[PDB]
Design an enzyme around this catalytic site. Sequence first.
Site, PDB file in Angstrom:
ATOM      1  N   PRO A 221      12.314  33.300 -20.918  1.00  0.00           N
ATOM      2  CA  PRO A 221      12.547  33.677 -19.515  1.00  0.00           C
ATOM      3  C   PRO A 221      13.656  32.841 -18.891  1.00  0.00           C
ATOM      4  CG  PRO A 221      10.220  33.186 -19.958  1.00  0.00           C
ATOM      5  CD  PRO A 221      11.008  32.652 -21.106  1.00  0.00           C
TER       6      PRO A 221
ATOM      7  N   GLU B 115      10.399  31.845 -12.029  1.00  0.00           N
ATOM      8  CA  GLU B 115      11.798  32.312 -12.207  1.00  0.00           C
ATOM      9  C   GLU B 115      12.350  32.824 -10.870  1.00  0.00           C
ATOM     10  OE1 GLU B 115      13.424  31.792 -15.259  1.00  0.00           O
ATOM     11  OE2 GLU B 115      11.535  30.681 -15.421  1.00  0.00           O
TER      12      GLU B 115
ATOM     13  N   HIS C 203      15.970  16.959 -27.904  1.00  0.00           N
ATOM     14  CA  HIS C 203      16.897  16.556 -26.852  1.00  0.00           C
ATOM     15  C   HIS C 203      17.772  15.387 -27.273  1.00  0.00           C
ATOM     16  CE1 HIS C 203      13.903  18.918 -24.764  1.00  0.00           C
ATOM     17  NE2 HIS C 203      14.645  18.938 -23.673  1.00  0.00           N
TER      18      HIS C 203
END
Lengths: 686, 194
Positions: free
Chosen positions: A328, A357, A487
């Site tokens: 999403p 969102e 990351h």
Amino acid sequence: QSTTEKNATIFLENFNSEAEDLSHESALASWNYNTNITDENAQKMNEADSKWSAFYEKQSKLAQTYPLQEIQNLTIKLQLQVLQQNGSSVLTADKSKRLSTILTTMSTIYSTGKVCNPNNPQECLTLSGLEDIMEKSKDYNQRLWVWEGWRSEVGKQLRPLYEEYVVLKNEMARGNNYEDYGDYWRGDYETEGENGYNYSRSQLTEDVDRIFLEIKPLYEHLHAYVRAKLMDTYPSRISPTGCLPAHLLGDMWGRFWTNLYNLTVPFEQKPNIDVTDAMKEQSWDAEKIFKEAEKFYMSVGLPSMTPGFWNNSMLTEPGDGRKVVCHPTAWDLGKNDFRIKMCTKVTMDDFLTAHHEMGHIQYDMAYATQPYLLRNGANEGFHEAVGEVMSLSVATPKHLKGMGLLPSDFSEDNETEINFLLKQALNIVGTLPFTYMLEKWRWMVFKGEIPKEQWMKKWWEMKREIVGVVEPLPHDETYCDPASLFHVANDYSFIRYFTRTIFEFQFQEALCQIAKHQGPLHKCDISNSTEAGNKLLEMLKLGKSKPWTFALEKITGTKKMDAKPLLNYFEPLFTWLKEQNGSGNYVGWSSDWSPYADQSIKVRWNDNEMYLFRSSVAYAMREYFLKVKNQTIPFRAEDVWVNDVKPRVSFKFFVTSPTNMSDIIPRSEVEDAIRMSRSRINLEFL
Amino acid sequence: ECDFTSMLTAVPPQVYNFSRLVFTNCNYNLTKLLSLFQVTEFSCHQVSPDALASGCYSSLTVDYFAYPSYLASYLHPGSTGEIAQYNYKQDFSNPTCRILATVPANLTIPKPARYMWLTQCYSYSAFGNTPLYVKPSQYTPCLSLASQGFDADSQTHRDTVNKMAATGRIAAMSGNLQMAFVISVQYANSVCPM
Ligand SMILES: *[C@@H]1O[C@H](CO)[C@@H](O[C@@H]2O[C@H](CO)[C@@H](O)[C@H](O)[C@H]2NC(C)=O)[C@H](O)[C@H]1NC(C)=O
Ligand SMILES: *[C@@H]1O[C@H](CO)[C@@H](O[C@@H]2O[C@H](CO)[C@@H](O)[C@H](O)[C@H]2NC(C)=O)[C@H](O)[C@H]1NC(C)=O
Ligand SMILES: *[C@@H]1O[C@H](CO)[C@@H](O[C@@H]2O[C@H](CO)[C@@H](O)[C@H](O)[C@H]2NC(C)=O)[C@H](O)[C@H]1NC(C)=O
Ligand SMILES: *[C@@H]1O[C@H](CO)[C@@H](O[C@@H]2O[C@H](CO)[C@@H](O)[C@H](O)[C@H]2NC(C)=O)[C@H](O)[C@H]1NC(C)=O
Ligand SMILES: *[C@@H]1O[C@H](CO)[C@@H](O)[C@H](O)[C@H]1NC(C)=O
Ligand SMILES: *[C@@H]1O[C@H](CO)[C@@H](O)[C@H](O)[C@H]1NC(C)=O
Ligand SMILES: *[C@@H]1O[C@H](CO)[C@@H](O)[C@H](O)[C@H]1NC(C)=O
Ligand SMILES: *[C@@H]1O[C@H](CO)[C@@H](O)[C@H](O)[C@H]1NC(C)=O
Ligand SMILES: *[C@@H]1O[C@H](CO)[C@@H](O)[C@H](O)[C@H]1NC(C)=O
Ligand SMILES: *[C@@H]1O[C@H](CO)[C@@H](O)[C@H](O)[C@H]1NC(C)=O
Ligand SMILES: *[C@@H]1O[C@H](CO)[C@@H](O)[C@H](O)[C@H]1NC(C)=O
């Protein structure tokens, strides 16, 4: 109004006009590819990215002719700062090219990493299938070869690549007038201001250090309750006073503790609120999910969606044969064009994702009147924080009851609230010590406070004392355990996840006071409060044109990061945890215990002496199990683990079974085998 | 004897460039004006559908433009969408009725190529954009820019002298033509039915 400022104003007005057109073309090409993955669409995307990059590089060279000390206007000054950043062009052509090769190698090694079973070589696994094991398995030995396998294959490749990465990134940061690459990252929070609105880069380390010590009493009580539950699943594998073994935390890195909920649930008999079956009994489609989110935002005073939102979004997975990757995302293409890409099922999790969102879309629509370069959140933590605040309110039983998704006679008992708040803390409180320690480590590596000869030594010292987590096997300087995370191998800053949490509960507490809520914060619903949505909207309109401390004061009334709002939200759980741990549970941990410490043998001289010593031990084991146990066990120098090495020659070691790393050979049998072969081995043994 | 011919013998304009008929000193038949089309909406306001043709008014006004029917919700003036922001704001100072219709294949009204409307209209500077909002029963200040038309979505025309910009959206002219009528009367025995 100096000639320079007058000249810079004409320069910035021509750039803004041309960037709107080129940004829209580049974003339209990127959307067409991501919703329809074909090779033809993948070249149209790269052609448009090249046009943007050519234009932007030419405009950055034009921007360098306007000195910032001659600009008295802050809006003009903030736009020129963005355009004048040099980035990696401060390095030579060879050094710049080397740094891009290292970045591509490290992300390729991570994404093709593959581990497999020491006892079954024909079945090997990628990261997707290894993470299913870490998130479901309750087998100690299975979780250990997956945990050690990921570090041993993936992590040991990135260690030489990461040492070069650190040297190159420090050269770039110094060429842009920073102390180092950690100082460069901390500049995302730096601001100038007149009346207490300034914020330096050194202020961020002090503030993050102070907030961590304020949440630690609550984290210690959750650590103690989780440790006592883990002692029933894994008998004799956990000390009641020590740290938690790192391979038993419910995922590969221990970032989140959420998958430990089935083991730690306060009241298992009482179930948690789930309304998926109510949405199916009323025949909701994916369109109606997004029509309910729009009604929520309109109830607090925020605008509706544009007509083009509904025609242009991808709210369901297509069935025309198009290939997409479902994740999403909210898109701000510019020119009043907002789209959401989502594969929506009729579930409760997708109902909450839609509200999150649509919160990002509402922020983008608010600062769309800013200059092009100032169209962002106030800092890197404000955007996600806004989305989270909106999801807190809509997940409440009060909100769901008003929607008809809960029975009209629904009553809430305090045992279901403790179940709700524990599941929230396994995510929000569990990950805060994890995030802080990793940034603290990276910052010290870029400074040079940790030399590269002590990278893994300091990594596990910090894990033991800040996080309360101990490694199941000892790792030397041939590993790079931080780089086995996504990351770190992909060069992403990580302190945004710390700040976002702090800002989300500051925002939440301010808005529930404006909405006039009585009772605990976790039960608060801001729906139907236009005075709360108007206060939120004055911060959202600012974009990046003001100091983030000024936008923080607009909504919360204070200029500083503050952790007391987070501790208020989790106050009903903190009271229940102290009754649970109060013979109850010891609170705190000792950095002395380890899963392998009681079987070590202390031996009271370079690295070639180790490889010979471990083979002498390995031979001695193999002969002892044949001449006494009448067994043929192929012990190797890889089954001998050296730990706790002092500069003066004094180390410890233990032996594991060649196929089963969970099985440590008892200290009694190892001592006997050394005595038998003491002549050939020759060295004081303590 | 009010004439509606000029409403029927030329291509209709777009929503930002609506045409206006003001009828004074004539007698009307609203039933004859609509039976020609396929009314699919008649939402009114401080008046009603049956009282619309019944009354006698100081003046009568008709605004009309090409309009896709799937954008019916955005034509209400109390919306925060682009139609009320930049194209056409309906004036609730007087009794008004809003009629959405379809032009049958028998009616020989010339068709336009496509439907057009504005998504933005603003003045630009190094300090950001300022949206220009249309006033009730008036015309957008971006009319001079918008007059040229739009052939794609998110196409911008800039006025480099006054520093104004306008952005448009389009929709394909599929099937029969669809239009919208907004009728507002004022209060008085000049304008009457038969
Ligand atoms: C998905 O992408 C394909 C590949 O680009 C599209 O197919 C092309 O469509 C264009 C129309 O703009 C034609 O000119 C090309 O000849 C088509 N090529 C191929 C290989 O089919 C397709 O239209 C896209 N689908 C959707 C729904 O947008
Ligand atoms: C945008 O989406 C709407 C859906 O609301 C589409 O509206 C449909 O249009 C067709 C043809 O005009 C009608 O037969 C349907 O009845 C309409 N649906 C509804 C729910 O009214 C519209 O066509 C879309 N526009 C574009 C350009 O794709
Ligand atoms: C926000 O307020 C609206 C009314 O302004 C609420 O809508 C009503 O809700 C009740 C039950 O809560 C229903 O029985 C009514 O049928 C609803 N009326 C309409 C017109 O929808 C709405 O429930 C409130 N939202 C929340 C989350 O409390
Ligand atoms: C939910 O509330 C009930 C009150 O009805 C709590 O029950 C009390 O718990 C305390 C624990 O310190 C006891 O001293 C009382 O004797 C209990 N009273 C009754 C009437 O049972 C219950 O503990 C609460 N549950 C949670 C999880 O907080
Ligand atoms: C501003 O631009 C004009 C035109 O290029 C130039 O003549 C003038 O010297 C510039 N002023 C400054 C201070 O750059
Ligand atoms: C900066 O420019 C803006 C826009 O012209 C103006 O409103 C503001 O007063 C200026 N500030 C200073 C300090 O000159
Ligand atoms: C970027 O590099 C150029 C080239 O030397 C230099 O003149 C300029 O000062 C640099 N920009 C900044 C903001 O330091
Ligand atoms: C702002 O500047 C003042 C004086 O320069 C300094 O004392 C103060 O610490 C600064 N504030 C922050 C948050 O760095
Ligand atoms: C927790 O239990 C539920 C219900 O039995 C199950 O669906 C889920 O997979 C379990 N999760 C874990 C991590 O074991
Ligand atoms: C008004 O027009 C309709 C449409 O044919 C017609 O039937 C009706 O007789 C007219 N009314 C009068 C009063 O003539
Ligand atoms: C408005 O529409 C009329 C036709 O109805 C046309 O003659 C006129 O030029 C238009 N004005 C514009 C496009 O500005």
